[PDB]
Amino acid sequence: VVYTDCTESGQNLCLXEGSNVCGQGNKXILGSDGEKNQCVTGEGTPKPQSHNDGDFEEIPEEYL
Amino acid sequence: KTFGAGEADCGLRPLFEKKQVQDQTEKELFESYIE
Amino acid sequence: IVEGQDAEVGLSPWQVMLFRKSPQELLCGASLISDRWVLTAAHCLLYPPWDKNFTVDDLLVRIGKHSRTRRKVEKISMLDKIYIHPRYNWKENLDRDIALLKLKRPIELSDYIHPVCLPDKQTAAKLLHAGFKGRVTGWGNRRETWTTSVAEVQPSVLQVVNLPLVERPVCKASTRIRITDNMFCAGYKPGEGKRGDACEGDSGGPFVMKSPYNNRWYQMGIVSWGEGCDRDGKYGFYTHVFRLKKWIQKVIDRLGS
Ligand SMILES: *[C@@H]1O[C@H](CO)[C@@H](O[C@@H]2O[C@H](CO)[C@@H](O)[C@H](O)[C@H]2NC(C)=O)[C@H](O)[C@H]1NC(C)=O
Numbered sequence: 001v002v003y004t005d006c007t008e009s010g011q012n013l014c015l016x017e018g019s020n021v022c023g024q025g026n027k028x029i030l031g032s033d034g035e036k037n038q039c040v041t042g043e044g045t046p047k048p049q050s051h052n053d054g055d056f057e058e059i060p061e062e063y064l
Numbered sequence: 065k066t067f068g069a070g071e072a073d074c075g076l077r078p079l080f081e082k083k084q085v086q087d088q089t090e091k092e093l094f095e096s097y098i099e
Numbered sequence: 100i101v102e103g104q105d106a107e108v109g110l111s112p113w114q115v116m117l118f119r120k121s122p123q124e125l126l127c128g129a130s131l132i133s134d135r136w137v138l139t140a141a142h143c144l145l146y147p148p149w150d151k152n153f154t155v156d157d158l159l160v161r162i163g164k165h166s167r168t169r170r171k172v173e174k175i176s177m178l179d180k181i182y183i184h185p186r187y188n189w190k191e192n193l194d195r196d197i198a199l200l201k202l203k204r205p206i207e208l209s210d211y212i213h214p215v216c217l218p219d220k221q222t223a224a225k226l227l228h229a230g231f232k233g234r235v236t237g238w239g240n241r242r243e244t245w246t247t248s249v250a251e252v253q254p255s256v257l258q259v260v261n262l263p264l265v266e267r268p269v270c271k272a273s274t275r276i277r278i279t280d281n282m283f284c285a286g287y288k289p290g291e292g293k294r295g296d297a298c299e300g301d302s303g304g305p306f307v308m309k310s311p312y313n314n315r316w317y318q319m320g321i322v323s324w325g326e327g328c329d330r331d332g333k334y335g336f337y338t339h340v341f342r343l344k345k346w347i348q349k350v351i352d353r354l355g356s
C-alpha cells in the first residue's frame with residue numbers, strides 16, 4: 001500500500017500534513033491556496049485504490 | 065512433500081549462478097558487504 | 100519501481116505477478132518459493148479499507164514473465180488456496196503483512212521460472228545489517244505521480260533497483276507510523292547520491308539479498324507499505340520474512356496443505 005496525497009477533504013489513509021499519513025480515526029481537511037492541510041480527529045473515507053494496470057495482452061480462455 | 069520440489073536448488077538462477085555468470089549489478093551488493 | 104532499470108532476462112526467475120481475473124489487471128507482486136507455493140503480502144488479498152477480500156476464484160498468477168507484448172516462456176496458474184497470517188493486523192499499519200498462495204498444480208521449472216530461498220537464523224544473522232544492499236523488483240509505477248495519465252509511469256519490462264538496509268532508529272524517526280519488529284525499512288538517505296523505491300503495483304513482491312557464503316538468493320523482505328514513493332527522508336517498509344518463518348513453515352508442513 002502506498003499512501004499518496006489526499007485529493008478531497010474528508011479522505012484518510014492518504015498523505016495530509018506533509019509526507020505523513022492521516023490514519024483511520026482521522027480525516028484530512030485540505031487547505032485551499034495559502035492554507036495548510038490539517039489531519040483532524042474524525043471519521044474519514046479511505047482514498048480509493050488507483051486504477052490497476054490492465055495494459056497487458058488478454059490471457060486465453062482456459063484461465064476463466 | 066507438502067512443500068514440493070525446489071528447496072535443494074533454491075536461489076541459484078539458471079542463467080546466472082548455474083552458468084557461473086554474474087548479473088549487471090550484483091557486484092554492487094557484494095561491495096556493500098565489504099566496502 | 101522508482102529510479103530502477105530494466106531487468107536482464109532471467110534476473111529474477113522467482114518473480115510472480117498477481118492478477119485479478121476479470122477485468123484482467125495487475126494487483127501486486129509475489130514470489131515463487133517452490134514448485135507449488137507463492138509468497139506475497141497479506142494486504143494484496145485482504146484490505147478492508149478498500150473492501151478487498153479476494154477468493155481463489157478472483158485471481159491468477161503469472162510466472163516467468165519479462166516484458167509486455169508490443170511467449171512459450173511464461174506460466175499462468177490458478178490458485179488452490181489462500182493463507183493469510185493469523186495475526187495480520189491491517190489496523191496496526193499492516194503488522195505481519197504476509198500471505199501464502201498454493202498453486203492449483205505444481206509447475207515445471209525453467210530458465211525463467213525458479214524458486215528463491217527463504218532465510219534461516221544464520222542467513223538473517225549474516226545479511227541483515229544497516230548499509231548492506233538488497234534488491235527489489237516489480238512491475239509497478241516508475242513514479243509516484245503523473246501529469247496526464249498513469250500509463251505514463253507503467254514499465255514495459257520488469258524493473259529492478261538495489262537499496263540499502265537502514266538502521267532501525269532512522270526508520271522510526273522517518274515516520275509517525277508505529278514500526279514493529281515484523282517490519283524493516285530500506286532506501287537511500289537524502290544526499291547519499293542515489294535514489295530508488297518500490298511504488299504502486301510492486302506491493303507483495305520480493306526484497307532479496309545474495310549470500311556470498313553459498314552463492315544463493317534469499318528473500319528477506321516483502322514490499323509492504325510506503326508514505327509516497329522515493330520521497331526524500333522517507334523509506335520503504337518491508338515485511339521481515341525471517342521473523343515470520345515459523346508461520347510459513349507451519350502452513351507448508353500442515354498435512355492437508
Ligand atoms: C473475508 O471473506 C472470508 C470468506 O471468504 C471470511 O471468512 C471466514 O470464511 C468462511 C468461508 O467462507 C466462512 O465460513 C466464514 O465467513 C468465516 N469462517 C468461519 C467459519 O468462522 C472472512 O471473515 C472475510 N474477512 C473480512 C475481514 O472481511
Ligand code: NA
Nearest residue numbers: 329330331333
Ligand atoms: Na526516500
